[PDB]
């Protein structure tokens, strides 16, 4: 409900999206309705950004989780420096973590299967600390995000 702006919920969203990108959907009850809606819109954004920024993205080597974290935080800082938060921008956070995990899969110097869990963690830390209050004031994931992006 309203607690969906807390770290655990956001972490699960970020982890679900990376597992989608990596094609490792996990067994069990399956992703939440929110996560299902997010995966479609974020993937559409991710493919658009991959095409639009292809020349730039091919000139960055994401060789470690620490490089991924620093780059993610650098990019997020500049993306959000104007103080504007909206749902479209929040979607691009997930799209960008999907871009990072794909590069890591190809370029990580010492590959480690738990890496996407570390990416999910620093993504959730950014979303919660920098947009969590806005998310709450705008209905959370269930009453804000899903209402904007679910099928009509």
């Amino acid at each position: 409900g309203m607690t969906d702006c807390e770290f655990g919920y956001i972490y699960r969203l970020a982890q679900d999206y990376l597992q989608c990108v990596l094609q490792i959907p996990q067994p069990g009850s399956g992703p939440s309705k929110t996560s299902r809606v997010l995966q479609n819109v974020a993937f559409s954004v991710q493919k658009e950004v991959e095409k639009n920024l292809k020349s730039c993205l091919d000139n960055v080597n994401v060789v470690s989780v620490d490089t991924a974290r620093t780059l993610f935080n650098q990019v997020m800082e500049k993306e959000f420096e104007d103080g504007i938060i909206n749902w479209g921008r929040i979607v691009t956070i997930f799209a960008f973590e999907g871009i990072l995990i794909k590069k890591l899969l190809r370029q990580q110097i010492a590959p480690d299967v738990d890496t996407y869990k570390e990416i999910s963690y620093f993504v959730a830390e950014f979303i919660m600390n920098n947009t969590g209050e806005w998310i709450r004031q705008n209905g959370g994931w269930e009453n804000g995000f899903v209402k904007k992006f679910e099928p009509k």
Partner: peptide, 21 residues
Amino acid sequence: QRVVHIAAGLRRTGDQLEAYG
């Protein structure tokens, strides 16, 4: 500069999605 360019592209795509999606 690569950080600035990526951030600006994400911002532009996000603001477009906000206004249309």
